């Protein structure tokens, strides 16, 4: 909450971006009617950081370091650009890379529980040039998939995958067989979004059965393949 | 969280202590021999202020029942500042006086609702008497006076404000912001001005000025980005055939088109400049239509089906001169027409009726000022930041107070107007005895502003109060000179709008508070 | 968490201490000389209120057993506010009166279940006597008193509500919202209107009005987004051949179609305007069918398989006049017919009877009001938010009381209606002596509201209670002027539904409370 | 969180206790027999320093009401440094003297605003006489004295800075940076130099010094990366025909072209060197345009519709010599015309007047220096790091003091100027007797600097203050040698700008604080 101190349009985008002083998020944000836009954008920046709701204290009032700030705002183009202190994104112990739980918590999640923001679609952001290497960061990605597929680590291109036909209700081993069949085809698959431990096809048997189907399909094709288990 | 509850005098006693703490803090800012309050803000240096509402906003007490009292009278200081800027302490001092008498009246066993109805009747009559006392304020001397008094007797501010409102006229907008010199300065902006500069240095034809100046240019008004020179070629050809220069006003000029224009101008084939449109969104559209109206030009837009490939010198507007800088553009004597301007001004003035948002209304006021007046900046000169922030706040009050005088008139200051009206209502009566005492509460408490003004001098208030009530008309006591005289000839004036507002809102909150019988709050 | 448990008299005494705290906070609000309660809300300014339930919701005690006492009788305030919206303080006092005397009967060794059965019998019969005393209320003068009385003796709200109910009529809807002036003002909306404005300014044909006006227009009700004007051409061709203007109502018009209409309007070939359909979801489709029905048009949808290329001026609706603004659309005299509208109203009337939610019932009443009546908005005027938020809650009180009176009639206020029924039941007896005492507790408690109303005035309650019981008929004590008279002649009226409500809910809770033998709760 | 508030003498005493704690921490550093202060820092060695304001920044009291006093006088100590470099302790002593005498005078009952106006008048009159007392400083010896005194009697610094200013001339830029030896050393850089080296080692043609040197070279100023040798071929062909060596300055040279130049240079086909352009952004284009101006070349750039393939030997600049190293490039005697260069200087000098940002002004000042004046670096010699920072902080002061002397003159130091002007204003009077006390308050406190200078020596201060007032003119007391004499002949001079500044900013802050009547801050 609050707009005071949260309006900080004096912050230069150059030191924020190229100086890396802040993570910089550009929102197409529209308030609800009658709210002050800059207050909403600044108030949205508070939700995008410390919260600072009704009151903040540390046995002796105040709290002022954690705040993510609006640094460009312009009501009629619906633009809300918010600069976030790098301290907001606490480092994960596994790698020293910032927990993205914070970032979502501070952009498109608990911060969006603000109601007088009608919407705040982030169209873009920036992350500090150096500390970017210490954002949570995809230690595995397409480039590592290429590597396990035996492709070059540069432009290993399309890792082919499917949504298993015919989507829901396909039992684990028919689903695994559809994965096998697909993996007599291409490279990659996911579980469906309801195909967690839901009783129509739980994860463990499906993933056990799908994993066998992958090895079978690999053995029958001579090329590596991949499955995406619905851990949700 | 479990609540705590109190009843009756054990409740009301807690309430009164709260109000007294806040009011006692605020009182000391009152009048010309008042003193400053220092406010702690942990972010930086403390801020010294005389601004009543600034002090009132911070006060909030530890003991929860005590805190509740301060939080109520905080409402009156906020609104009076929101309603009319100046007047905040006087409204507070009035509100505290009525509360203390009301608890006095309730302890005598009056029914509190009849007291409220009594108070509301006295205020209703008192406002009508103030409207009868008001006399017009209509010249620089009267305006310079009220400016001086609101500035806390700083004649330089009063003089300066009279000049500023004279130059920009009643439709003009006046503003104040932090200067750099050791003395004040007045800048007046005339014609149209907006915060967009040249898009490249090479347009600069007067590098000694550091600026672009063009004589009798065409002005093009493109409602979109400019992307390829192909969209403009016939215009530059048509302009080149006419030989006069051209100003592009557009949402953007992309580098290749821009560079091609930069090339052609430096090599002298045709003389051109380009600027981004001011603002954004719908207000940009309005402002683009405003400049078109002022220049007599036409807004080129695809929503009406126009094409730059079909634009002509009839669609472009004109002006006698334009000047553009690294950051700034000005258009001098646009070739619009008066009937169109007043019609356009009438539209915006009607929109000013529709603008419920005050900030947006100010923007509409700025837009009409651009079309029909000027804009001025007062630069505050002071040696130090703790004085910059003090001096600035006094100029703020002087601007609001001078504004408030012109539309409603002025009355003798020093509270003597509010003393006089209290003598006229002496025949007013209620339906029942409880309403009579409720009426009398108002007539007694209205003396409180003069009493506090004098008390800050260390004079004896009741001795002066007795003699001022013995006076006639505008006879009153001047606390600066410590002698009596005619307030109009002595130049001590108050805007009728602030004095009337300070009473109305004060009686509103107090008229409730005397009726409080129970309070519920969380255990500490 | 380990609980603490108590048994027998130790439980009941702590529970009784709980109820009295919540009761004593509300009681002080009762009657015309009641007093305000101040409610703390740390997230903003404290709330000043006279509303019983608004105080009752805030009470929560630290002692877990005392917390149970407040938390039990709080049910009565919530149910009374939902069922009738007025009388909650009255309903609370009756509940607290029965509980105290009931526990007294338990301490005498009476079997609690016979008190419950005895109480329930007496209250059941008492409601039958209220059906006999109620008289119809059916004129503007009668309604104005119950409004004024429930408003706490303010005629202006009563006079205003008496006008509002007359203008919108029996099926109309009335609403109250925060104004900005000091005076109250009543707005009334004729015909059907909804909060959608012009999709562009270029439709504006009254630029000074900021509005679109078209006469005898066709109205198109497209149940889809209008994408390509090639879809519109055969309809627009027919309209252009007719030369009459057309209003488009659609789920959207995309820019190429919209812009082409904007182009076509500027050059004056056909007068057209486009607006979003009101609402969203199936109610949007319903409102489109309603607009069609009111206008005599037909809804065009791909669900039925009709298509714009096949639509005709026979499918389009018509009306005598339409007006649209930046935010608002209204239709004047649709070419619908009384039989079709009434049949549609019957469908919605069946839906209102079927509506399990008052929100749905509200959303249903709005459309029949738009179809067959109108809507009124009362904007409350006040000088400040605390008074504003106070004032509105008293207007709300009158608006439900006036509604409640029209469907149930009125009886003399001041509790005297309860006194007169408390005499008629004196012959009632039960199956056993414990039930006879159960009757006696109830018949004794119905005197409690009058005694509190007197006590808040500072008068001796039993002297007034004796002198009223010595009278007959509507003879009662006028607490506003401290005299006896006919309450119907004095205009002091309560809606029969609130009194009949306040009993039944109060006796339902209090008749359970006293059978409590044990309490279990978590240790502190 | 809950505030605490205090009024009147209880607040004012707590305020005064705060100021004196900060003042005594600063007081001990004043004058030639002053002593060092040890400042704690959480992450390293304690910093030994003599600089007054550097102590003043660290002070921060535990008691909030005391803390507010210190945190205000820190503001005058900071600003006096920002305005003038040296002159912090003097401003802090003057402020603390007036506040004590002002608050002392307030206890007598005088109106604080008449005191404020009285002080403000005295300071305003005093500045006029100081502007009259100031005398020109021009010769190297006079500059050497003010350098010596500011250095705290380290004559070597005055001699060294006097030579540095003599070599670079009054347009030049002098800076100080860490050395490594015991001795202070002066490095003067002349012509143009910028911090980019050879892009590859293989260009090195004097490996006996790791250096590239070229004589009468052509210089290419490429505004963009060099990426395809066909960009260069036509120039390289023409350069090869001329046979003179070539220097490339470019945004970059890609490996293909760069390595191909390495091949052609190693094999001796063309004498070529390439360097990265200095910096980035518009400052690069500006700096490149400066080099073009100095060299008579042209910035080959797309914005002017030019291509490297179209550039010619007429477009390349020339200079007598260039030298480039691993990290540094220098250009000797560019062929640019003095009138063109002078005009460019006038452009950049005009930018200095418009540049409000001081950091930009140094950037602009370096470019006018490197075009038209010397660049100098002073390397401070010290035996160890804690001695390094101390010694460095004294050298830093001699620059600001010597610079300050050149533009505004000097007056007799040792506070004597303040003593002499105090004797002239004794006839000054105000509007009222409280203002008369206000005039006399200021004229009293101006002795406070001299008394501390003597008291830090341990001499009896009021004796020396009497004898100095017994003398006339530049007669004064030389605290370094415990004898009276003419301050001009001993060279104890202070810049007028620093003495005048310390008085103004002290009076500005002190005159506000003594009007304090209330303070509000958080409970501990
Ligand atoms: N020279 C003076 N003599 C007597 N009263 C004065 C004089 N100058 C100003 N006043 C009074 O000071 C009162 C306080 O107004 P102001 O200083 O603006 O504080 P606020 O408006 O916040 O109460 C005004 O009613 C004004 O008439
Ligand atoms: N002038 C009056 N004389 C006697 N009784 C009155 C008068 N005005 C109101 N009442 C009584 O006060 C009660 C209504 O007060 P109210 O604050 O609305 O309580 P509740 O919230 O329970 O409705 C009713 O019983 C009504 O008859
Ligand atoms: N030999 C001296 N005799 C008398 N006064 C001196 C002597 N040397 C320096 N001073 C004075 O000491 C005062 C403070 O100088 P300095 O310590 O540089 O100020 P700061 O501590 O603010 O840098 C000046 O008024 C200066 O003239
Ligand atoms: Mg009620
Ligand atoms: Mg010094």
Curated annotation (Swiss-Prot), chain A:
Residues annotated for substrate binding in this entry: 110, 167
Modified residues (N6-carboxylysine): 190
Residues the record lists as binding Mg(2+): 190, 192-193
Annotated active site: 165 (proton acceptor)
Domain of life of the source: Bacteria
Quaternary context: Homodimer.
Family, similarity comment: Belongs to the RuBisCO large chain family. Type II subfamily.
Functional description taken from the UniProt entry: RuBisCO catalyzes two reactions: the carboxylation of D-ribulose 1,5-bisphosphate, the primary event in carbon dioxide fixation, as well as the oxidative fragmentation of the pentose substrate. Both reactions occur simultaneously and in competition at the same active site.
Note, other: The basic functional RuBisCO is composed of a large chain homodimer in a 'head-to-tail' conformation. In contrast to form I RuBisCO, the form II RuBisCO are composed solely of large subunits.
Protein name: Ribulose bisphosphate carboxylase
Organism of derivation: Rhodospirillum rubrum (strain ATCC 11170 / ATH 1.1.1 / DSM 467 / LMG 4362 / NCIMB 8255 / S1)
Lineage: Bacteria, Pseudomonadati, Pseudomonadota, Alphaproteobacteria, Rhodospirillales
Interval of the full protein contained in this chain: 2 to 233 of 466
From Swiss-Prot, chains B, C, D:
A Pfam short name: Cpn60_TCP1
Binding site for ATP: 29-32, 50, 86-90, 414, 478-480, 494
Gene Ontology MF terms: ATP binding; ATP hydrolysis activity; ATP-dependent protein folding chaperone; identical protein binding; isomerase activity; magnesium ion binding; unfolded protein binding
Record text on activity regulation: During the substrate-folding cycle, the two GroEL rings separate for effective substrate binding and chaperonin activity. Ring separation is triggered by ATP binding to the trans ring of the asymmetric GroEL:GroES complex and avoids formation of functionally impaired symmetric GroEL:GroES2 complexes. Activity of the GroEL-GroES chaperonin complex requires Mg-ATP. UMPylation of the chaperone by SelO/YdiU negatively regulates its activity, and may facilitate survival under stress conditions.
Effect of residue 1 to S: Complex stability is significantly decreased.tuberculosis
Keywords: Acetylation, ATP-binding, Chaperone, Cytoplasm, Isomerase, Nucleotide-binding
Modified residues (N6-succinyllysine): 33, 50, 116, 276, 320, 389
Subcellular location per the Swiss-Prot or TrEMBL entry: Cytoplasm
Mutation effect (residue 108 to C): Forms inter-ring disulfide bonds. Prevents ring separation and leads to the formation of high amounts of symmetric GroEL:GroES2 complexes
Effect noted on mutating residue 397 to A: Can bind ATP with normal affinity, but is defective in ATPase activity. Binds non-native rhodanese, but cannot release the protein
Enzyme type, top EC level: isomerase
Domain of life: Bacteria
EC number: 5.6.1.7
GO biological process terms, semicolon-separated: chaperone cofactor-dependent protein refolding; protein folding; protein refolding; response to heat; response to radiation; virion assembly
Chief location: cytoplasm
N6-acetyllysine carried by residues: 116
Domain notes: Each subunit is composed of an apical domain that binds non-folded proteins and GroES, an intermediate domain and an equatorial domain that binds ATP and is involved in inter-ring interactions. Forms a large central channel that appears to traverse the entire length of the cylinder with no obstruction. The central channel of GroEL functions as two cavities, one in each ring, that are separated from each other by the crystallographically disordered 23-amino-acid C-terminal segments of the seven subunits. The entry and exit of polypeptide seem to be restricted to the apical end of each ring. Modulating the volume of the GroEL central cavity affects folding speed in accordance with confinement theory. Small proteins fold more rapidly as the size of the cage is gradually reduced to a point where restriction in space slows folding dramatically. For larger proteins, either expanding or reducing cage volume decelerate folding. A stepwise reduction in cage size results in a gradual loss of cell viability.
PANTHER family: 60 KDA HEAT SHOCK PROTEIN, MITOCHONDRIAL
Family recorded in the similarity comment: Belongs to the chaperonin (HSP60) family.
Protein name as it appears in the record: Chaperonin GroEL
UniProt organism field: Escherichia coli (strain K12)
Gene that encodes the chain: groEL
């Amino acid at each position: 909450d609050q707009s005071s101190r949260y309006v900080n349009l004096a912050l230069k985008e150059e030191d924020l971006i190229a100086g890396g002083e802040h993570v910089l998020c550009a929102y197409i944000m529209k308030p609800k009617a009658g709210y002050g836009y800059v207050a909403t954008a600044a108030h949205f920046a508070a939700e995008s950081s410390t919260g600072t709701n009704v009151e903040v204290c540390t046995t002796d009032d105040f709290t002022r370091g954690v705040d993510a700030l609006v640094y460009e705002v312009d009501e009629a183009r619906e633009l809300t650009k918010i600069a976030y202190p790098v301290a907001l994104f606490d480092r994960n112990i596994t790698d020293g890379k910032a927990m993205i739980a914070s970032f979502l918590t501070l952009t498109m999640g608990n911060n969006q529980g603000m109601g007088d923001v009608e919407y705040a679609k982030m169209h873009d952001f920036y992350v500090p040039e150096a500390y970017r290497a210490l954002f949570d960061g995809p230690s595995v990605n397409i480039s590592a998939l290429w590597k396990v597929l035996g492709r070059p680590e540069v432009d290993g291109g399309l890792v082919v995958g499917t949504i298993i036909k015919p989507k829901l209700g396909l039992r684990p081993k028919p689903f695994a067989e559809a994965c096998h069949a697909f993996w007599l085809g291409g490279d990659f698959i996911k579980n469906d979004e309801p195909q967690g431990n839901q009783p129509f096809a739980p994860l463990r048997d499906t993933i056990a059965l799908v994993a066998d189907a992958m090895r079978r399909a690999q053995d029958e094709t001579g090329e590596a393949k991949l499955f995406s288990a619905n851990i949700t | 969280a479990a609540k705590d509850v109190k009843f009756g005098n054990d409740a009301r006693v807690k309430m009164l202590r709260g109000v007294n703490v806040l009011a006692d803090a605020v009182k000391v800012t009152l009048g010309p021999k008042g003193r400053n309050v220092v406010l702690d803000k942990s972010f930086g240096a403390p801020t010294i202020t005389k601004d009543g509402v600034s002090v009132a906003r911070e006060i909030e007490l530890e003991d929860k029942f005590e805190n509740m009292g301060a939080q109520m009278v905080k409402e009156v200081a906020s609104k009076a500042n929101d309603a009319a800027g100046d007047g905040t302490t006087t409204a507070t001092v009035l509100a505290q006086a009525i509360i203390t008498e009301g608890l006095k009246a309730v302890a005598a066993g009056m029914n509190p609702m009849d007291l409220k109805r009594g108070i509301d009747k006295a205020v209703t009559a008192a406002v009508e008497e103030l409207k009868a006392l008001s006399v017009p304020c209509s010249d620089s001397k009267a305006i310079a006076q009220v400016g001086t008094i609101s500035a806390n007797s700083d004649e330089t501010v009063g003089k300066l404000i009279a000049e500023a409102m004279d130059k920009v006229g009643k439709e003009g907008v006046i503003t104040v912001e932090d200067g750099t010199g050791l003395q004040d300065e007045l800048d007046v902006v005339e014609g149209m001005q907006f915060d967009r500069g040249y898009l490249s240095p090479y347009f600069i034809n007067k590098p000694e000025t550091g600026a672009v100046e063009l004589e009798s240019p065409f002005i093009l008004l493109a409602d979109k980005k400019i992307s390829n020179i192909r969209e403009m070629l016939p215009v530059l050809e048509a302009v080149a055939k006419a030989g006069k220069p051209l100003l592009i006003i557009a949402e953007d000029v992309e580098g290749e088109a821009l560079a091609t224009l930069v090339v052609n101008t430096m090599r002298g084939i045709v003389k051109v400049a380009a600027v981004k449109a001011p603002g954004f969104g719908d207000r940009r559209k309005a402002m683009l239509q405003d400049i078109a109206t002022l220049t007599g030009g036409t807004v080129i837009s695809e929503e009406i089906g126009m094409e730059l490939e079909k634009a002509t010198l009839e669609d472009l507007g004109q002006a006698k001169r334009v000047v553009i800088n690294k950051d700034t553009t000005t258009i001098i004597d646009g070739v619009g027409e008066e009937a169109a301007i007043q019609g356009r001004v009438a539209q915006i003035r009607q929109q000013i009726e529709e603008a419920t948002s005050d900030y947006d209304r100010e923007k509409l006021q700025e837009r009409v000022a651009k079309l029909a007046g000027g804009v001025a900046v007062i630069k505050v000169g002071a040696a130090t930041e703790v004085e910059m922030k003090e001096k600035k706040a006094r100029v703020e009050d002087a601007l609001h107070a001078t504004r408030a005088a012109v539309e409603e008139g002025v009355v003798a200051g020093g509270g003597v107007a509010l003393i006089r009206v209290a003598s006229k209502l002496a025949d007013l009566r209620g339906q029942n005895e409880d309403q009579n005492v409720g009426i009398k509460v108002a007539l007694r408490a209205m003396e409180a502003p003069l009493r506090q003004i004098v008390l800050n001098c260390g004079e004896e208030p009741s001795v002066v109060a007795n003699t001022v009530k013995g006076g006639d008309g505008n006879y009153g006591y001047n606390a600066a000179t410590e002698e009596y005289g005619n307030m109009i000839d002595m130049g001590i004036l108050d805007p009728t709008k602030v004095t009337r507002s300070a009473l109305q809102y004060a009686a509103s909150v107090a008229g409730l508070m005397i009726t409080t019988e129970c309070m519920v709050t969380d255990l500490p």
